[PDB]
Structures are given as C-alpha cells and as structure tokens.
Amino acid sequence: RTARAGYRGRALDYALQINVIEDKRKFDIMEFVLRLVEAQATHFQQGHEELSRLS
Amino acid sequence: RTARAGYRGRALDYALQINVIEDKRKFDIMEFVLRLVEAQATHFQQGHEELSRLS
C-alpha cells in the first residue's frame, strides 16, 4: 500500500519534470540563437555606418 | 679619364634609382592599405544588405 502510493507520488514528480525539460530544451536553445543573431547583427549595423564612410 | 667619367655615369644611375624608390615605396603600401579596407567595406555591406530580412 505505502510502496504503491509513494511510487505514484514519485511518478507525479518525474512526469512534471519531463514536461519542464521539454520546454527548457526548446526555450534555452531558442533564446541562445536569437541572442547571438541579435548581437552579431548590431556590429555590422554600426560597422557599415563607419566603413561605408571609409569606402 | 675613362674611370672618372664612367664612374660619374654609374653615380647618376644610382641617383636615378634611389630617386624612383623614395616616391614608389609610399604609394605601393598605400595601395596595399587601400585594398585592405576596401575588402572590409565590401564584406560589411553584404552583411548589412540582408539585415532587414534578419531583423
């Protein structure tokens, strides 16, 4: 009885974290890419202002 | 009279040729630096040109 009830409470905590990992693997990697593309892009924006005057 | 004359003749050629390299040294290396920042201007502009699509 107590073994079965506890396996089931432990099951609820594994399940819920399996949903947390699934969104964490999406959002941490999506934010990473978007931060990198965003910060690369500004360096060209600012760059070209100056280097087109240098052209 | 041979030695002295033709040494004056040899001295003039040295004079001509040093006089060419003083003007020449500055231009060629300026040209080299021209071609350096040219390729940079050309690289930031290709990357600046699609910046709107990325944004």
Curated annotation (Swiss-Prot), chains A, B:
Cells overexpressing ACAP1 show an accumulation of ITGB1 in recycling endosomes and inhibition of stimulation-dependent cell migration. Cells with reduced levels of ACAP1 or AKT1 and AKT2 show inhibition of stimulation-dependent cell migration. Cells overexpressing ACAP1 and PIP5K1C show formation of tubular structures derived from endosomal membranes. GTPase-activating protein (GAP) for ADP ribosylation factor 6 (ARF6) required for clathrin-dependent export of proteins from recycling endosomes to trans-Golgi network and cell surface. Required for regulated export of ITGB1 from recycling endosomes to the cell surface and ITGB1-dependent cell migration. It is found in: Recycling endosome membrane. It comes from the Eukaryota. This is Arf-GAP with coiled-coil, ANK repeat and PH domain-containing protein 1. Highest level in lung and spleen. Low level in heart, kidney, liver and pancreas. Banana-shaped homodimer laterally assembling into tetramers, the tetramers further pack helically onto the membrane. Interacts with GTP-bound ARF6. Interacts with third cytoplasmic loop of SLC2A4/GLUT4. Interacts with CLTC. Interacts with GULP1. Forms a complex with GDP-bound ARF6 and GULP1. Interacts with ITGB1; required for ITGB1 recycling. PH domain binds phospholipids including phosphatidic acid, phosphatidylinositol 3-phosphate, phosphatidylinositol 3,5-bisphosphate (PIP2) and phosphatidylinositol 3,4,5-trisphosphate (PIP3). May mediate ACAP1-binding to PIP2 or PIP3 containing membranes. Only one PH domain of one ACAP1 dimer inserts into the membrane, while the other PH domain acts primaryly to interact with adjacent ACAP1 dimers. The chain holds residues 160 to 214 of 740 of the full protein.
